[PDB]
Amino acid sequence: ADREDDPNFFKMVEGFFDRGASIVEDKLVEDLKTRETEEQKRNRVRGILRIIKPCNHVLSLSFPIRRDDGSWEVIEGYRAQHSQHRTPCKGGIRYSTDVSVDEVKALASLMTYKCAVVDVPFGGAKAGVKINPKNYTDNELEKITRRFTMELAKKGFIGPGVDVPAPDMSTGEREMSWIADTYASTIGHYDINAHACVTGKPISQGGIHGRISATGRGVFHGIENFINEASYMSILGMTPGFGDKTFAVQGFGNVGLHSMRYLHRFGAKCVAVGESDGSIWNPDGIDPKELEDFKLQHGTILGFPKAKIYEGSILEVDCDILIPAASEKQLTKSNAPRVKAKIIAEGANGPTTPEADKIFLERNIMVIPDLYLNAGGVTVSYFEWLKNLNHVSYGRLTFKYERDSNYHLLMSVQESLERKFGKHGGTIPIVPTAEFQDRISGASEKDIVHSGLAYTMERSARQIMRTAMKYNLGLDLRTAAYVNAIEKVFRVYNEAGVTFT
Amino acid sequence: AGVKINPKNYTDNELEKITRRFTMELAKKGFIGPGVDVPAPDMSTGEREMSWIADTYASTIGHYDINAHACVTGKPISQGGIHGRISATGRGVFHGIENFINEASYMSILGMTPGFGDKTFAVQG
Amino acid sequence: ADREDDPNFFKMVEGFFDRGASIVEDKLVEDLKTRETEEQKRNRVRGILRIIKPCNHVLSLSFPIRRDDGSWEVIEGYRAQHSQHRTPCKGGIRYSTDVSVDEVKALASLMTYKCAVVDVPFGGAKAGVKINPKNYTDNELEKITRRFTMELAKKGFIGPGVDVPAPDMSTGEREMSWIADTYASTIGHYDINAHACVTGKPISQGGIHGRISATGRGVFHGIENFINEASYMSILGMTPGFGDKTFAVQGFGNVGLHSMRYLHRFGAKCVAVGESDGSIWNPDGIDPKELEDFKLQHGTILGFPKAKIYEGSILEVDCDILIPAASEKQLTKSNAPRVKAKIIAEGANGPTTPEADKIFLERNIMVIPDLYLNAGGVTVSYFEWLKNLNHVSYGRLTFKYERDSNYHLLMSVQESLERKFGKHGGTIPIVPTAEFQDRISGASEKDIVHSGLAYTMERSARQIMRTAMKYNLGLDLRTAAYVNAIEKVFRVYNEAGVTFT
Amino acid sequence: ADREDDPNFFKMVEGFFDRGASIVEDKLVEDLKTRETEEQKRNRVRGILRIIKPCNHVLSLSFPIRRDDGSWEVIEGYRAQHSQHRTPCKGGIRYSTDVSVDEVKALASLMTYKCAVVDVPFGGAKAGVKINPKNYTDNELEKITRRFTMELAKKGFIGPGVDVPAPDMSTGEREMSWIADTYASTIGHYDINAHACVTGKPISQGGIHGRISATGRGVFHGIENFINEASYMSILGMTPGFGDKTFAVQGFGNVGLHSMRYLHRFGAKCVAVGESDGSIWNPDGIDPKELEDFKLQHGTILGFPKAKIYEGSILEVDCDILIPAASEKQLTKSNAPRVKAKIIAEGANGPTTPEADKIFLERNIMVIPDLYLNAGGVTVSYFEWLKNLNHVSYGRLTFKYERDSNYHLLMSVQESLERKFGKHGGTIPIVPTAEFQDRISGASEKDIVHSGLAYTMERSARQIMRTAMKYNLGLDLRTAAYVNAIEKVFRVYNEAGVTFT
Ligand SMILES: NC(=O)C1=CN([C@@H]2O[C@H](COP(=O)(O)OP(=O)(O)OC[C@H]3O[C@@H](n4cnc5c(N)ncnc54)[C@H](OP(=O)(O)O)[C@@H]3O)[C@@H](O)[C@H]2O)C=CC1
Ligand SMILES: NC(=O)C1=CN([C@@H]2O[C@H](COP(=O)(O)OP(=O)(O)OC[C@H]3O[C@@H](n4cnc5c(N)ncnc54)[C@H](OP(=O)(O)O)[C@@H]3O)[C@@H](O)[C@H]2O)C=CC1
Ligand SMILES: NC(=O)C1=CN([C@@H]2O[C@H](COP(=O)(O)OP(=O)(O)OC[C@H]3O[C@@H](n4cnc5c(N)ncnc54)[C@H](OP(=O)(O)O)[C@@H]3O)[C@@H](O)[C@H]2O)C=CC1
Ligand SMILES: Nc1nc2c(ncn2[C@@H]2O[C@H](COP(=O)(O)OP(=O)(O)OP(=O)(O)O)[C@@H](O)[C@H]2O)c(=O)[nH]1
Ligand SMILES: Nc1nc2c(ncn2[C@@H]2O[C@H](COP(=O)(O)OP(=O)(O)OP(=O)(O)O)[C@@H](O)[C@H]2O)c(=O)[nH]1
Ligand SMILES: Nc1nc2c(ncn2[C@@H]2O[C@H](COP(=O)(O)OP(=O)(O)OP(=O)(O)O)[C@@H](O)[C@H]2O)c(=O)[nH]1
Ligand SMILES: Nc1nc2c(ncn2[C@@H]2O[C@H](COP(=O)(O)OP(=O)(O)OP(=O)(O)O)[C@@H](O)[C@H]2O)c(=O)[nH]1
Ligand SMILES: N[C@@H](CCC(=O)O)C(=O)O
Ligand SMILES: N[C@@H](CCC(=O)O)C(=O)O
Ligand SMILES: N[C@@H](CCC(=O)O)C(=O)O
């Protein structure tokens, strides 16, 4: 962000990894099966961690496209595959002028550790195309996407069993449609799983309910899991719950907008919203719905009638919770002194530098880390991939059977009681509550996504708190998450004997 | 499948090579694959050999197969193994005995009481 | 490696390309059968040249190996594919600590243009592994080589119809054997052309006669084609021919040793040899055999009894012809003022910076450029690939038929003359000269390699001379070669309509 | 069979291998590159020879067919691949009740060493189906063949670049047609080389001129190369040449009939012919043409009008040359004392036991060994495979250009002499002899099969003679052949580093 506050993104994530490696090193050496404790054990542990951290594969591309006015342009693209310790690699595609090999490797490694934290059986990957999509027509972006797909597919950097992309900054449903159609019409014409080659697809194409809003819905769940912990909310000097709290979100895209929709729903009040244009502000609250309608209509948030063009940086606005939901390295050493919030919920990937971490720790500011908090996108992408593999809408085969079963179950209770308390207890109707009537046919896809997401966001939160307490890490939840991620990944390399995976 | 060696006479380094190689020769001739032929442990092989088999398969012929790790069973749990495979054969030895040891019709021809609480056994191996 | 004579290798080769592009730009715009100028024709031309310049594909690798001690090491590797305008890419593998993405991209592009100069139907590629092979056992190097092969094969960066590697610095026959065996035993088990996946193989494995010495044999042919040109030898102030000239060679490896073997054979005098150790010197001549025998025996050329340890840089030694046959960027701006030879024969790839080119021009020093002079290696690798595709030793099917044919041909002349000048002439024996008796059965593989190489080195030389005369380039033969390479490559992008090739 | 004269066919060929290994062991240790002559050289050499001996792969098959009357029948089949040191394995298919794993492994190893003797770049393989084809209809044999092909193809035991079968006993043109059609219509439908999956095909079907007679034509050439060697014919006490010698052939099938056709053509007289039925005899000569006509007409040779039913074993008939052209192990310990002939030309594979070798040596009987003498079939099969790879009839592109070229060559001589000896010389016509006129368009496919075969039969004979002298092996030409074969195969294992080839 600043100058000399601007570390190498990949090394910075390596630093987070090293932090966590220091703390579990003893525990890893502990539960080793192996021969003689010459702590050659210790060196074996440290050799495996050396294998995990670098990317295994990075493809760099140049390829031409023919612009709308007839000119030729060369555009560059990358896709890094950080780890294959679990076989389909997973990670999004970013269209931005900031894309580099540097940045794509960093995000690929975050994907590996994030999947381990939430227990999604994917290795990490990430792709980037070095363009500003503002400067291209829809016709041009289709050509760029379709061709990026074919160059990746010929070199084994996309495929249902190899590497499954997804949306990231400046890509969405529409690009994923183009990726899936290009794959399933060329290399994947005979693959029964061709459409599992990418996630974030439109629902009419093998998409899944809620994937668009999935990352924000998991930002809500991850904040709620900590905002309702008395142990943590006391060190921060705050009341548990949402009903009284304010937040600011940087970024009004896929992550920002839905984070703000869900927190607003549960009582919290949106105080400030920012984009690259600038920010808006209103201490009385901003409504997500009418702000979205405004942006859709005018292409900017600036000039929203029910708020204030805020001069003075979103990141330092006064609120309880600050949600970075845009680029990386937004909270720096020069920046953290004024942050004025007590909870930093990283919706973005890598939005805080290590020395901003130092500061936040000694002001008792809680950073809910990216590799836990934004993992809702990859969790629901995992559900979408599973759905394509199965070729049925969840519940489709069982709705009627379930509904009938549950009525006969309840009827069994009714008839059993009528038998006992016979003739002059009369009729004892056993009927579903209003809530059970909703579930009477069993889960649909929407139900699976919702409760599946909530289950893993909370199982993961409680593993991070368990770990932070056991190593006495206070509010350094980032280190706790990496400790968890490292332990999971390390076990696969143990039994395997490495050499590859 | 069978390999004519006595594994006690080999180092772990040597057994890894034997196993990884045996896998490749089988895979080239279509004698291992998720939809073709799925090996498993037997005498003197276990979790460890099954790891080597799955890794060798999924890193060569099966690099693009979404089901590469279904090429062998008995794998360690951290590797796509399943809970209880190690003890599975004995747990089914227990169930298969109990299904007959509680059958009065059969336990009578044998002159025995139903149930386990009063019986001795010997195991070879 | 110094501090401000040390340009980015890939950009530097781009610069050589740009000069050549300047000069043919008019001639490319000329022969365009397309609609009419609007000088959209001119924009089309430099849009195509913009597509040719960058590498299409670069794979970066990390993978672990088990050292002999039991320790784990991560080693890096790269392979760039510069162009697919001709389908099998071609280029060597370098094991060196100087290997990087930009070094591998630079060498890959030189391979494209060198193949075009000599009319070998391959696109350019190059691989690198970032190790110093002197620090590894043969066991360890086997491992590294066989790994590197499998990682390349899974991602389509090696294959008979995709990308065919070859030796480079610190690799040879032995590594090529490991590469071919690993390929043909895994991914290529059913490919009838599996052993065409790499060239430079041992003869017993589908190698071809003379590949080892092929680069030096083409260094000799390329010097001889210019050393016997009165027009050029006059601007330099020298006598045509080899019989009176001295040379120094930097590098005593695959290129250096055989360059020095062949020049010594045709009368020239080797005055100095260098390696990384240092150099040796003797103005009376060094013999290539006994120097080779000494190196094989002691592992160094320092201390050769028949010469004396030269202190003072082999590149400035006093000779007629200087042969850089080692690393790149050896002749720099700080260096060229004292070069003291009048012919610089670039056996190595990229051994002169652009800044040193400027100087050598003004001093009337003739640089025979790499993309012409060292192309003997890829020319004979092309023959080896063809041989593997055909599955016969040249001549095998025809030796006897050919030998019998030629004797009946000669007998036809004999009997025809005996018929006419009847018995006043007796017997008129028609028999082969001693030289025809050698060819009586037609060419063998050795004959094909020898005369095939001489034919292309010579045709290519005269193409460069014509071009240098027709644009009045003087001794800037480097620009003439790039003009030729650009014309050949541009030809394919024209009719194709680009978009993929 | 012969009771306690009846060794394990595979072990017996291993024994032949071992005697050759004895003799070159010193030589092999000689030209090893490598470092420590520590008597670890010697152990490497033996370790490599231990790898070469055993078959790498043996597929055993059971599969059902429905017989013509509706009954089901399981039939067994095998195919052994002895070596992959050269990539397409090669070897025939035998339909016989004597087929076993041990017979198929023995013949497969013979194929490896025979291909090495004649320098055909194939590893050895052999298949067998355990039936007596005289007990099946043509309908039934088609189903057995087409099915045997599919079971081999699914497990990678047939394919143009894997394993290429051919005829053997009781199979021919017809079966090879069925094999090629089954392959090219299922697994090979997209393979440009599908029809190179088997050799011995009918000419209309991608077969090659002379494959049918090729084995006998090479029997003739291999006898002729030794029958015209004064050095050898003197130890036997015979006159060089064919014009005054008799021979007997056991087996009147593919090998026997054509061996007898070619020897009869060059003056030798056929004295006795045998099959499983029995034999016929006439010291006065048997004509191959009319004997063939009789067999085609009556299905047996017994009762040929111009000969008498011989009762007393054709192997002991009184002749100069005995040609075993049927099964293996036909000349035994109990048998060799009475053999009567001075030259045993092994057309069959493995027709002589090792103990019969011992005897023949001490009676100064010359055994021309199988791995040299019958290698004409695989030599011309190699030509057929090459032909299918090239997709042109030899000469097709060049006939007219050759003819024209040869006329103008000759005209150059004519005009050159006319200008020198001007007027008083008149016209000096230069015209082809009658022999050159046949050749004037260059070789056809027939010409290359003929002269190609003669070239390799002769080059191989000399190499055996050279070797038998360098080791003072007398008439033990079998050991000389194995010495040659072992040297060539050992080559490939040296540079390779073994582990897969
Ligand atoms: N896409 C997904 O589903 C997931 C994304 N993430 C991470 O979340 C972040 C973005 O996600 P996403 O919402 O998809 O990207 P989008 O393009 O959907 O939205 C990006 C938002 O960030 C804004 N933005 C970009 N740069 C800046 C900046 N320097 N200052 C302020 N606002 C900025 C854009 O506004 P403008 O148009 O004004 O630039 C836009 O509103 C990245 O870190 C990404 O890796 C993580 C998990 C899932
Ligand atoms: N290999 C081939 O077939 C072809 C190679 N080339 C180019 O030729 C050059 C070398 O080829 P090759 O002969 O194969 O390489 P080798 O590794 O075979 O031999 C290299 C020689 O160069 C010497 N050398 C290396 N670095 C230096 C240095 N910094 N200063 C002085 N001497 C040095 C080495 O000496 P030491 O042992 O002391 O390092 C060794 O004598 C490279 O540029 C290569 O790309 C071009 C065409 C074909
Ligand atoms: N086929 C080839 O191209 C080559 C074959 N060989 C070897 O040569 C032999 C095959 O010759 P081929 O002509 O191909 O086979 P065929 O089946 O074509 O002819 C076989 C001949 O041998 C006769 N025969 C079989 N067993 C006996 C026996 N025990 N005693 C006497 N005669 C017998 C058959 O008689 P009936 O007709 O009554 O069975 C028939 O006349 C085998 O050893 C084979 O491996 C080696 C190199 C090339
Ligand atoms: N961009 C945008 N998306 C919306 C809006 N309202 C609903 N959605 C999304 O559209 C999809 C379908 O809506 P619903 O069926 O109501 O979703 P839901 O499962 O009930 O849960 P929610 O996501 O909380 O609405 C869900 O993913 C919503 O998140 C909106 O106002 N703007
Ligand atoms: N060798 C050995 N294996 C054990 C022992 N206890 C459990 N296991 C096996 O380890 C696996 C995990 O064990 P648990 O965590 O106890 O789960 P479980 O299904 O209750 O195990 P069991 O009922 O004992 O089979 C199961 O397959 C057990 O059979 C033990 O004491 N010794
Ligand atoms: N390193 C090295 N290579 C040699 C030497 N002599 C010959 N060679 C190379 O080894 C191969 C075999 O050499 P030859 O049998 O003489 O065939 P050639 O084609 O006439 O060899 P040259 O013309 O000398 O290159 C050829 O590639 C030679 O260039 C030598 O003394 N040292
Ligand atoms: N079975 C059999 N084959 C024959 C006979 N005569 C010729 N052939 C073969 O049929 C093929 C075609 O015959 P030709 O036109 O004479 O060809 P060729 O090259 O002149 O044949 P040869 O010199 O006899 O080997 C050749 O392979 C001959 O060997 C015969 O009488 N019986
Ligand atoms: N860009 C998303 C991708 C998630 C997915 O692969 O679905 C992330 O950072 O997690
Ligand atoms: N390194 C060699 C390799 C040539 C080849 O591909 O054979 C070169 O620079 O040309
Ligand atoms: N059975 C023949 C077949 C040769 C071939 O492969 O064509 C032999 O023994 O040599």
PDB file of N, CA and C in Angstrom, chain C residues 218-253:
ATOM      1  N   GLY C 218      29.800 -27.814 -36.726  1.00  0.00           N
ATOM      2  CA  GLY C 218      29.140 -26.678 -37.330  1.00  0.00           C
ATOM      3  C   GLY C 218      29.761 -25.339 -36.983  1.00  0.00           C
ATOM      4  N   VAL C 219      30.487 -25.258 -35.865  1.00  0.00           N
ATOM      5  CA  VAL C 219      31.325 -24.089 -35.626  1.00  0.00           C
ATOM      6  C   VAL C 219      32.429 -24.016 -36.676  1.00  0.00           C
ATOM      7  N   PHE C 220      33.042 -25.162 -37.005  1.00  0.00           N
ATOM      8  CA  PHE C 220      34.095 -25.156 -38.021  1.00  0.00           C
ATOM      9  C   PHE C 220      33.535 -24.762 -39.379  1.00  0.00           C
ATOM     10  N   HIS C 221      32.400 -25.348 -39.780  1.00  0.00           N
ATOM     11  CA  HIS C 221      31.813 -25.047 -41.087  1.00  0.00           C
ATOM     12  C   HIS C 221      31.411 -23.581 -41.193  1.00  0.00           C
ATOM     13  N   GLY C 222      30.872 -23.006 -40.121  1.00  0.00           N
ATOM     14  CA  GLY C 222      30.423 -21.625 -40.183  1.00  0.00           C
ATOM     15  C   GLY C 222      31.560 -20.629 -40.222  1.00  0.00           C
ATOM     16  N   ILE C 223      32.693 -20.958 -39.582  1.00  0.00           N
ATOM     17  CA  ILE C 223      33.881 -20.110 -39.691  1.00  0.00           C
ATOM     18  C   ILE C 223      34.489 -20.246 -41.076  1.00  0.00           C
ATOM     19  N   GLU C 224      34.574 -21.469 -41.586  1.00  0.00           N
ATOM     20  CA  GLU C 224      35.191 -21.710 -42.886  1.00  0.00           C
ATOM     21  C   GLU C 224      34.432 -21.022 -44.016  1.00  0.00           C
ATOM     22  N   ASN C 225      33.121 -20.938 -43.886  1.00  0.00           N
ATOM     23  CA  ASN C 225      32.323 -20.275 -44.912  1.00  0.00           C
ATOM     24  C   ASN C 225      32.630 -18.781 -45.001  1.00  0.00           C
ATOM     25  N   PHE C 226      33.017 -18.163 -43.890  1.00  0.00           N
ATOM     26  CA  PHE C 226      33.377 -16.754 -43.885  1.00  0.00           C
ATOM     27  C   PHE C 226      34.874 -16.515 -44.024  1.00  0.00           C
ATOM     28  N   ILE C 227      35.704 -17.438 -43.536  1.00  0.00           N
ATOM     29  CA  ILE C 227      37.148 -17.285 -43.622  1.00  0.00           C
ATOM     30  C   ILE C 227      37.667 -17.473 -45.038  1.00  0.00           C
ATOM     31  N   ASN C 228      36.857 -18.029 -45.936  1.00  0.00           N
ATOM     32  CA  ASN C 228      37.231 -18.214 -47.324  1.00  0.00           C
ATOM     33  C   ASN C 228      36.501 -17.242 -48.244  1.00  0.00           C
ATOM     34  N   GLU C 229      35.911 -16.196 -47.681  1.00  0.00           N
ATOM     35  CA  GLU C 229      35.219 -15.142 -48.423  1.00  0.00           C
ATOM     36  C   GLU C 229      36.170 -13.935 -48.540  1.00  0.00           C
ATOM     37  N   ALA C 230      36.709 -13.728 -49.746  1.00  0.00           N
ATOM     38  CA  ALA C 230      37.658 -12.628 -49.939  1.00  0.00           C
ATOM     39  C   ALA C 230      37.053 -11.288 -49.549  1.00  0.00           C
ATOM     40  N   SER C 231      35.793 -11.054 -49.928  1.00  0.00           N
ATOM     41  CA  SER C 231      35.113  -9.799 -49.612  1.00  0.00           C
ATOM     42  C   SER C 231      35.208  -9.450 -48.131  1.00  0.00           C
ATOM     43  N   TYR C 232      34.967 -10.432 -47.258  1.00  0.00           N
ATOM     44  CA  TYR C 232      34.988 -10.167 -45.820  1.00  0.00           C
ATOM     45  C   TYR C 232      36.410 -10.194 -45.254  1.00  0.00           C
ATOM     46  N   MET C 233      37.246 -11.156 -45.689  1.00  0.00           N
ATOM     47  CA  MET C 233      38.610 -11.264 -45.168  1.00  0.00           C
ATOM     48  C   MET C 233      39.449 -10.041 -45.497  1.00  0.00           C
ATOM     49  N   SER C 234      39.020  -9.229 -46.463  1.00  0.00           N
ATOM     50  CA  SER C 234      39.763  -8.020 -46.812  1.00  0.00           C
ATOM     51  C   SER C 234      39.468  -6.878 -45.845  1.00  0.00           C
ATOM     52  N   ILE C 235      38.189  -6.643 -45.526  1.00  0.00           N
ATOM     53  CA  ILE C 235      37.868  -5.621 -44.528  1.00  0.00           C
ATOM     54  C   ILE C 235      38.574  -5.909 -43.215  1.00  0.00           C
ATOM     55  N   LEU C 236      38.828  -7.182 -42.928  1.00  0.00           N
ATOM     56  CA  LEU C 236      39.515  -7.562 -41.703  1.00  0.00           C
ATOM     57  C   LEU C 236      41.026  -7.515 -41.849  1.00  0.00           C
ATOM     58  N   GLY C 237      41.527  -7.459 -43.078  1.00  0.00           N
ATOM     59  CA  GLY C 237      42.954  -7.414 -43.299  1.00  0.00           C
ATOM     60  C   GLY C 237      43.619  -8.746 -43.041  1.00  0.00           C
ATOM     61  N   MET C 238      43.054  -9.821 -43.592  1.00  0.00           N
ATOM     62  CA  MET C 238      43.559 -11.171 -43.382  1.00  0.00           C
ATOM     63  C   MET C 238      43.577 -11.956 -44.679  1.00  0.00           C
ATOM     64  N   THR C 239      44.397 -12.978 -44.672  1.00  0.00           N
ATOM     65  CA  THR C 239      44.441 -13.934 -45.759  1.00  0.00           C
ATOM     66  C   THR C 239      43.283 -14.919 -45.631  1.00  0.00           C
ATOM     67  N   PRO C 240      42.650 -15.288 -46.741  1.00  0.00           N
ATOM     68  CA  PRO C 240      41.695 -16.400 -46.704  1.00  0.00           C
ATOM     69  C   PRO C 240      42.347 -17.685 -46.208  1.00  0.00           C
ATOM     70  N   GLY C 241      41.527 -18.557 -45.626  1.00  0.00           N
ATOM     71  CA  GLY C 241      41.964 -19.884 -45.249  1.00  0.00           C
ATOM     72  C   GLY C 241      42.342 -19.990 -43.778  1.00  0.00           C
ATOM     73  N   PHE C 242      42.633 -21.227 -43.380  1.00  0.00           N
ATOM     74  CA  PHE C 242      42.929 -21.577 -41.997  1.00  0.00           C
ATOM     75  C   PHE C 242      44.416 -21.766 -41.708  1.00  0.00           C
ATOM     76  N   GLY C 243      45.202 -22.174 -42.708  1.00  0.00           N
ATOM     77  CA  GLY C 243      46.567 -22.643 -42.528  1.00  0.00           C
ATOM     78  C   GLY C 243      47.514 -21.771 -41.722  1.00  0.00           C
ATOM     79  N   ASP C 244      47.214 -20.469 -41.582  1.00  0.00           N
ATOM     80  CA  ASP C 244      48.113 -19.532 -40.905  1.00  0.00           C
ATOM     81  C   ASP C 244      47.509 -18.859 -39.675  1.00  0.00           C
ATOM     82  N   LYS C 245      46.370 -19.314 -39.172  1.00  0.00           N
ATOM     83  CA  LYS C 245      45.657 -18.531 -38.173  1.00  0.00           C
ATOM     84  C   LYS C 245      45.665 -19.212 -36.815  1.00  0.00           C
ATOM     85  N   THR C 246      45.544 -18.384 -35.780  1.00  0.00           N
ATOM     86  CA  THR C 246      45.479 -18.816 -34.394  1.00  0.00           C
ATOM     87  C   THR C 246      44.086 -18.548 -33.841  1.00  0.00           C
ATOM     88  N   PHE C 247      43.714 -19.312 -32.815  1.00  0.00           N
ATOM     89  CA  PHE C 247      42.439 -19.071 -32.152  1.00  0.00           C
ATOM     90  C   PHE C 247      42.543 -19.407 -30.675  1.00  0.00           C
ATOM     91  N   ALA C 248      41.665 -18.793 -29.907  1.00  0.00           N
ATOM     92  CA  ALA C 248      41.477 -19.111 -28.505  1.00  0.00           C
ATOM     93  C   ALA C 248      40.016 -19.476 -28.268  1.00  0.00           C
ATOM     94  N   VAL C 249      39.793 -20.461 -27.404  1.00  0.00           N
ATOM     95  CA  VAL C 249      38.456 -20.926 -27.092  1.00  0.00           C
ATOM     96  C   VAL C 249      38.256 -20.843 -25.585  1.00  0.00           C
ATOM     97  N   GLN C 250      37.180 -20.170 -25.182  1.00  0.00           N
ATOM     98  CA  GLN C 250      36.739 -20.134 -23.796  1.00  0.00           C
ATOM     99  C   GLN C 250      35.692 -21.218 -23.601  1.00  0.00           C
ATOM    100  N   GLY C 251      35.969 -22.155 -22.702  1.00  0.00           N
ATOM    101  CA  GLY C 251      35.125 -23.317 -22.554  1.00  0.00           C
ATOM    102  C   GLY C 251      35.744 -24.512 -23.238  1.00  0.00           C
ATOM    103  N   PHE C 252      35.940 -25.601 -22.495  1.00  0.00           N
ATOM    104  CA  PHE C 252      36.516 -26.833 -23.020  1.00  0.00           C
ATOM    105  C   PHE C 252      35.530 -27.985 -22.866  1.00  0.00           C
ATOM    106  N   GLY C 253      34.237 -27.682 -22.963  1.00  0.00           N
ATOM    107  CA  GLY C 253      33.210 -28.695 -22.865  1.00  0.00           C
ATOM    108  C   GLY C 253      32.785 -29.228 -24.208  1.00  0.00           C
TER     109      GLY C 253
END
